[PDB]
Design a protein around this ligand. Structure first.
Ligand SMILES: Nc1ncnc2c1ncn2[C@@H]1O[C@H](COP(=O)(O)OP(=O)(O)O)[C@@H](O)[C@H]1O
Ligand SMILES: Nc1ncnc2c1ncn2[C@@H]1O[C@H](COP(=O)(O)OP(=O)(O)O)[C@@H](O)[C@H]1O
Ligand SMILES: Nc1ncnc2c1ncn2[C@@H]1O[C@H](COP(=O)(O)OP(=O)(O)O)[C@@H](O)[C@H]1O
Ligand SMILES: Nc1ncnc2c1ncn2[C@@H]1O[C@H](COP(=O)(O)OP(=O)(O)O)[C@@H](O)[C@H]1O
Lengths: 165, 436, 443, 435, 445
């Protein structure tokens, strides 16, 4: 499936404004703004990393630089509930303490029934046997981009649009 | 291509001018306003030369006197490959973009970058596709014979191009265009073999096509900005592009111009009803015109000594005097009986309506006496009343019936002033009941 | 039996074959010139040749301005799109009012498309995925292909898929023995249900059982779709229904209107023009009705001055009930109907006269015979006196309390004593204002 | 060929080595005192020792305030950061106006980094990785037209090579310092393995494999402020599709500021970075709200603030956002006390005539002497900018009748065709229905 | 090395004695004896720490030294005591409410002090070997850790192994492990292996191999304000919102929990409360709702001492239609003690200009200093304070070291003050755009 709207682009913009080459400094500026001058670099800002690890109680001091250099969805996907030491400024809320107990609590419990009113509303009003009323009229894929004579464009578009992770 | 039913400016093919910028009495759907047409021709020639930038020109006059028609003719005589942005005064009061951001986007939408690039393509009629594969499909060998009207050949294909041919299924008798570098195979249809339909391509199979690409600087700004992708050109969610990327694209455009890889194409930004922008917008406008990468701004308004928005005083044409100092003003004039008659005859010819001569004279008289647009609406209203009586030529009685049924400004305000008690006034008072 | 709410006694303009309006037809009483003008613009819209043509319905309250709009909406039928609107709709907190006006402009341009679809459907017999050599290589997929055996009536096919179609197939949680529906246009699949070739009475999943699909597995069928241009702009602005990353991710973000760019509208218009030029599509322009146009401020009128000059503009119907009222957003500009003169010059004002006492009485007769109520002639004359003395709508909305006070006394007819008791119970605007003037503590 | 837009006839302030301004030098005619004051300010900026120095140049419309600021920016060169700004642009719908004011303050402070660029490019002839499931390294051989060169590589660049689908025979691009990997395409010697293929075939690089080049990187403090303050997360190398969530501008806190400052100071103390403070130029300062003036009060007392140049064309004007505060040039009396006011003077007929002559000779136009006198008379009678803007329609009308010179008849025709503000106002007052 | 010559960088603390008696000219600032004594009393208030929620108000004419006084009290406050400085225009935000903005400005200026014992083991890795059991649940590891002077060997647990596989080392990277807490970081790659990989890469960096004793004992004192605790507690990953300002209306229940737990930590003995000062530039342009929230939030226990600066007279208050003294309403002014800064004379102006000349490395003659003092008498003081630098630039334009009378006269002639510009405007009002926009651009009548 391809979108009928075709956004043509010249090659020169892609070679000289996105792809690094010998005559530009996209990669050098990316390294300068992301690696060397990053305020979470432990080689230059170890005091700030120690301060933040004392605050959050994270076991790894390299984690803030890892978080600030990765996209949001990649941060969402491999988020692992690692253990945090109790000698830290991170706390437990009242709401988190209600939420953590009621993860595997069965029915006829006080906290479980008081914390699951939306599922009681779901099974009360027979929501698993109701027909669908609305469907969209037009459905379309995202707009395709063609660059006449660049397989790198096709490879990058196929990598973004069909990310295996 | 370029669908349209009938527009109000659909009869304007272009500016009617000679080789010496002399306006004809009637040419290309534009009659009258000789000095305004000559001034717009001077504007068009200055855009066509492209040697200057950032010159603001204001078009002003009475309402319904050729103001938007001049800009429509300018955009028509500009042709393709030159940008023409047409925004209104209320178009920049957004909720996700500031007024200066919207004005900067409207400015950078009207300057083109022209890049000519060459790509090899293979376009021909497919004769037969033979694909052989193993039991598990580890290796696939394929022979594709393909033909034109002049020559035919057989090609040995690797496994990736086999995977690109069983995808987007190509059978015998189909014509396709193959991009060899990117693998984009588009089916143009079927050839003349029935036993869609499109003729078999002729000439050489491997054609070297040079495509002249044009693009706006605003299009390259969102591409070079990493916070948003190219979809912000289509969903309109660019969201306050910073200036540090704007200096980068400006310096890269200057470098491309110095190296000869691209040529600048200046265009026209047209703002109709410019008298509704705030003073902040004008304060951005009068300094945005002093930049090399700025278009020629066409401004249109019909107000006279009106209140400027965001202030308490009144200014000529709704604009402060510094912007009027930076602008050259084209003044349009009203229309006589003959000009209105020729305009209505042009609208009758353009709407496929046959008119009686006496009906045309009555329409001209009521167009002079009330308004040009009132006759320009009744000339298409009365054709339906004519077709209710089942005859082609619209007579005087149809125009009289349409004038009786549909009121104009003066008759309606006269009826309102006669029956003020039945309407809701400025104090919210109304009398609905008939008696008492 | 049915439900009536201040309308539905109007079925159309009720004109003759020559366009002359009959006096009592289509539930209408009077308004002969207004109904004739509405018929004229009905033929103008059905001509389907004009763009940016607008009328303005002017008159007092309770004269039949909105009723004329529902009449032209019913006369054009449900095939031509009709978009009712109010002047307070355009003030959105998620996008500017200019974009809301342009979206409602594009929502009145319909489109009929005869679209062909490639359909692979049948009962799933086998489901065997082949794995990859290195599933933890970073790049690539977990599996290579998926073998699906589809069997329908008089046909049986074996399908080898990519991973990508199989992601959507296993998103629907299909299994062995379930009949599916692989639409090859967008890659979307639908779990049709369980097959009744196997057992039925051993399920707990409130399932439904459908027989085998007739015909072969691979199909090409023609579906006639009726969409608008605004739906095309929305579907291209927020893309859903592909088998890519963004097509998944668009269905889970919160819906929000965005400022649709003019370039997207050009591309949509270009592909619609190439659809029409192939003989596939058909363009159906419609009506955008904006009730209470005086509620708009000056900027929306200013953008209307441009949007009525666009080439794909619909026919706009405006209704107002102001005599000489300053336009909102301005202080000194005093204009008729709350509509500024630079757009009034582009309009065609249609006047709507008020009614006489006999017209009031027969309108009460029609609303009594529509609401399934029988009234006496003396009460009919009394209600005609109500309509000519206080308001037409006050006599219109006093039929049902009269009927209920008749029904609570075990009676079908309505007498004058019922109308007197309904006078004593319910007040009107004039009597409430009169008791508001001579009031102790702001009644 | 060349584009002229109301400027580019000026190249500098036209001073001598003693700071004295000449008559017509550098495209500037007249205005000796304002030009010498701007030269003194330019020398103060080049001294690079003071922070928060604020001047304001005030005068009539079409007197040369923006030309003076442009001459300051031309005299300072492209090395010094220059931030042009219009006082309407500070109003934003995403962040507060004062946040945009500090963002524009920190856009005018620059840094100079002396970096290097080491590039290996060529055709891959050998890609042999070795492990000990965990790869230890990979020996990569690159071949160009002037020889071949073998390289040992770290496993992260090997993983990036596997991401780019690099096989034997692909012309690749390797940057040494940042590990950037770009696949140019397959080599032209492997173009005959199939008669028709989806791969593009690029030739061999005609230079050497190893290329070394010394560059100089110029960044601003606002770029480093926005590099550490991405709320959604760090972007990848190539994202042609956008982010799924839209990143709006955020309230960049003060806590990030001294951390960025101490990182920059630590890099400066090692001698890698060179600090160049620059010029923030704000035009139409009267359009600012009083709260932006209040933040301009406290933002000029900071240790890192640049030199702020304001311009206005007003007299006794009420300040925006107030009722009863009549103040000179639209600036409140709090800010004027921290400012230095540079006077700007109007011109006479001779300076207007020479300015019109310079604008004619920068646009490649030939005018007669009598046409020049009529242009000067028109410029004195109506406006200088009107006479400047009527030069190019005069050139069009001269080109219409196939002449290379502009005569009196072209000037009369062009003044009949286009109207100034005064003639249009006179038509406006004596017209019935809205002109 | 990222601080140029500011407006008041010569001021280093409050020039007071041990008896809170201000010296006439010491520690950079001159004069204002009663104001310096009162600001020293406020300095003793903050350094005592036994009081909370007290509001003072420096009030004077423009160019007098209210912000100079607050800069002096900030410099004499010293390190590890929080001092934040905001303006009246900071509060009005778009996505963030006003009252929570005063809440954040209140909680940014009160901190807690914690300390801990850190036993760092920072060196270069030589060799890591892993012993795996048959069950594989627990893995033993031997780590060869090396510095320049000595190298030792440690045994590692299973969590050490699975935390070392993350941020993977490859036998020659430099790491630091805390023995007490198990904190793991990768400092980069040692310079001894800089020529081994032939391509530098992206995710790594080069630092020098550490030397000395491998086990280093060091205590670190952390001063954390309550705003960081609130932003961290409000989110799963709160440091990004801490550094990007995306806090977004933090709820009151987490503030109550943080206050209660900070109080019980003070009772336990882990932390101690370090109060500070909140300083507001130009407090007259706050809304009356902001003033209501100010006069209510000063009665809470965890509230800093707030000092405000105002240079207005009897003017109107924003959000209302009346006029009040100092632009602040009467229900706030009685919740304050008033500090008055009085105008200067010739001697104090001469001393301040001499200090500003000495701090800017500008040398003046006696007659030039007297002329600048006279100009600062007739005009204001900041005019002379910019005239000194402009005349210095004229001085090296003349190829002369010192600043003479001619340089000051040329700088006075080139640059105008407020009064001369007002005179030039009022004598040439036709050429300038007025209140109604009328202007006469042309020079010919
Ligand atoms: N010279 C002309 N030739 C043809 N049509 C014209 C001409 N001048 C005006 N018109 C018609 O008059 C109508 C009003 O002109 P328009 O420019 O749209 O309004 P305004 O002048 O108020 O901006 C338009 O529909 C246009 O077709
Ligand atoms: N000609 C008519 N025949 C029948 N009912 C009418 C007629 N004209 C108006 N009405 C009734 O009067 C009421 C007011 O009409 P409507 O157009 O909805 O509001 P308004 O007239 O105030 O704009 C409606 O409920 C409608 O049923
Ligand atoms: N001394 C000068 N030499 C040359 N051109 C000048 C001189 N002074 C003013 N100008 C011209 O006057 C025009 C208006 O000046 P500008 O600074 O742009 O606006 P304003 O003076 O109103 O701020 C400019 O285009 C500039 O070229
Ligand atoms: N008592 C003082 N001693 C030294 N310098 C002072 C004194 N008072 C004011 N100044 C200087 O005057 C300059 C401007 O005065 P400022 O403190 O801004 O006045 P205000 O407090 O009224 O805003 C500052 O740079 C400051 O260093």
């Amino acid at each position: 499936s391809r979108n009928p709207i075709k956004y043509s682009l010249p090659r020169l913009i892609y070679e000289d404004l996105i792809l690094p080459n010998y005559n530009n400094d996209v990669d050098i500026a990316n390294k300068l703004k992301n690696v060397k001058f990053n305020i979470f670099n432990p080689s230059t800002n170890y005091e700030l990393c120690l301060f933040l690890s004392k605050l959050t109680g994270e076991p790894s001091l390299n984690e803030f630089f890892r978080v600030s250099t990765t996209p949001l969805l990649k941060r969402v996907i491999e988020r692992t509930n690692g253990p945090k030491n109790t000698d830290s400024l991170s706390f437990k809320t009242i709401t988190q303490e209600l939420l953590e107990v009621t993860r595997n609590a069965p029915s006829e419990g006080v906290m479980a029934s008081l914390l699951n009113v939306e599922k009681h509303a779901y099974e009360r009003e027979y929501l698993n046997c109701i027909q669908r009323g609305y469907h969209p009229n037009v459905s379309a894929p995202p707009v395709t981009i063609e660059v006449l004579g660049s397989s790198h464009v096709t490879n990058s578009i196929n990598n973004e649009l069909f990310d295996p992770l | 291509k370029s669908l349209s039913l009938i527009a109000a400016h659909s009869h304007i093919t272009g500016l009617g001018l000679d080789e010496n910028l002399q306006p004809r009495p009637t040419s290309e759907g534009m009659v009258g306003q000789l000095q305004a047409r000559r001034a717009a021709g001077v504007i068009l020639k200055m855009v066509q030369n492209g040697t200057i930038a950032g010159r603001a020109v204001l078009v002003a006059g009475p309402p319904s006197t050729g103001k938007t028609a001049l800009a429509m003719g300018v955009s028509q005589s500009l042709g393709k490959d030159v940008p023409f942005t047409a925004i209104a005064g209320s178009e920049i009061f957004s909720l996700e973009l500031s007024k200066t951001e919207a004005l900067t986007q409207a400015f950078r939408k009207s300057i083109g970058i022209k890049i000519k690039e060459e790509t090899e393509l293979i376009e021909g009629e497919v004769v037969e596709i033979q694909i052989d594969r193993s039991i598990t499909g580890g290796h696939k060998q394929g022979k594709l014979t393909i033909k034109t009207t002049d020559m035919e050949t057989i090609y040995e294909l690797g496994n990736k191009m086999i995977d690109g041919l069983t995808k987007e299924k190509v059978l015998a008798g189909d014509v396709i265009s193959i991009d060899k570098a990117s693998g984009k195979i588009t089916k143009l249809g079927r050839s003349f073999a029935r036993s869609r339909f499109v003729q078999c391509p002729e000439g050489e199979l491997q054609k070297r096509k040079t495509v002249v690409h044009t693009v706006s600087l605003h299009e390259i700004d969102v591409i070079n900005s990493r916070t948003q992708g190219f979809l912000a050109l289509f969903t309109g969610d660019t969201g306050e592009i910073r200036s540090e990327v704007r200096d980068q694209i400006n310096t890269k455009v200057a470098e491309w111009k110095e190296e000869g890889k691209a040529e600048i194409v200046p265009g026209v930004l047209f703002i109709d009803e410019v008298h509704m922008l705030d003073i902040e917008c004008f304060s951005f406008i009068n300094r945005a015109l002093e930049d090399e990468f700025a278009p020629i701004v066409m401004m249109a308004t019909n107000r006279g000594v009106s209140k400027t928005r965001g202030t308490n005083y009144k200014s000529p044409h709704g604009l402060p005097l510094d912007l009027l100092d930076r602008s050259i003003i084209i003044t349009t004039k009203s229309y006589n009986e003959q000009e209105i008659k020729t305009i209505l005859s042009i609208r009758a010819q353009e709407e496929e309506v046959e008119l009686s001569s006496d009906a045309l004279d009555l329409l001209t008289k009521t167009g002079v006496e009330t308004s040009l647009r009132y006759s320009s609406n009744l000339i298409s209203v009365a054709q339906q009343i004519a077709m209710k009586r089942k005859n082609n030529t619209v007579e005087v009685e149809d125009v009289k019936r349409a004038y009786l049924l549909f009121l104009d400004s003066a008759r309606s305000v006269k009826y309102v002033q006669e029956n003020e008690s039945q309407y809701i006034d400025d104090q919210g008072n109304v009398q609905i009941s008939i008696a008492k | 039996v049915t439900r009536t709410a201040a309308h539905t006694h109007i079925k159309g303009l009720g004109l003759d074959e020559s366009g002359v309006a009959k006096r009592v037809e289509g539930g209408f009483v009077g308004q002969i010139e207004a109904r004739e003008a509405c018929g004229v613009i009905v033929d103008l819209i059905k001509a389907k040749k004009m763009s940016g043509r607008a009328i303005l319905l002017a008159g007092g309250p309770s004269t039949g301005k909105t009723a004329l709009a529902l009449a032209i909406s019913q006369e054009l039928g449900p095939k031509v799109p009709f978009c009712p609107l109010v002047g307070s709709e355009l003030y959105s907190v998620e996008v500017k009012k200019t974009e809301t006006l342009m979206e409602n402009f594009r929502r009145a341009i319909g489109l009929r498309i005869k679209e062909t679809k490639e359909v692979y459907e049948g009962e799933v017999t086998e489901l065997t995925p082949e794995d990859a050599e290195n599933p933890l290589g970073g790049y690539g997929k977990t599996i290579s292909h998926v073998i699906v055996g589809l069997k329908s009536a008089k046909g049986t096919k074996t399908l080898r898929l990519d991973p990508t179609i199989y992601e959507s197939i296993q998103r629907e949680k299909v299994s062995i023995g379930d009949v599916i529906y692989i639409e090859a246009n967008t890659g979307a699949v639908k779990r049709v249900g369980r097959s009744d070739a196997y057992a039925t009475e051993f399920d707990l999943e409130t399932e439904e059982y459908v027989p085998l699909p007739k015909g072969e597995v691979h199909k090409k069928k023609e579906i006639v779709q009726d969409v608008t241009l605004h739906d095309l702009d929305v579907a291209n602005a927020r893309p859903q229904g592909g088998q890519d990353v963004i097509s998944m991710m668009g269905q889970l973000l919160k819906p929000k209107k965005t400022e649709i760019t003019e370039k997207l509208r050009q591309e949509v218009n270009k592909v619609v023009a190439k659809y029409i030029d192939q003989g596939v599509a058909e363009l159906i322009p419609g009506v955008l009705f904006i009730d209470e146009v005086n509620m708009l401020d000056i900027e929306i009128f200013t953008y209307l001055n441009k949007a009525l000059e666009s080439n794909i503009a619909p026919v706009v119907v405006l209704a107002s009930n102001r005599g000489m009222t300053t336009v909102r957003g301005t202080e000194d500009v005093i204009s008729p109907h709350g509509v500024p003169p630079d757009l009034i010059d582009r309009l065609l004002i249609v006047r709507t006269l008020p009614y006489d006492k006999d017209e009031i009485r027969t309108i009460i007769e029609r609303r009594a015979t529509v609401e399934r109520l029988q009234v006496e002639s003396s009460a009919l004359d009394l209600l005609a006196t109500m309509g000519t003395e206080t308001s037409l709508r006050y006599a219109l909305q006093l039929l049902a309390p009269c009927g209920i006070l008749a029904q609570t006394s075990n009676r079908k007819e309505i007498v004058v004593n019922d109308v007197n008791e309904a006078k004593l119970l319910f007040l009107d605007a004039k009597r409430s204002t009169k008791i508001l003037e001579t009031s102790a503590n702001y009644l």
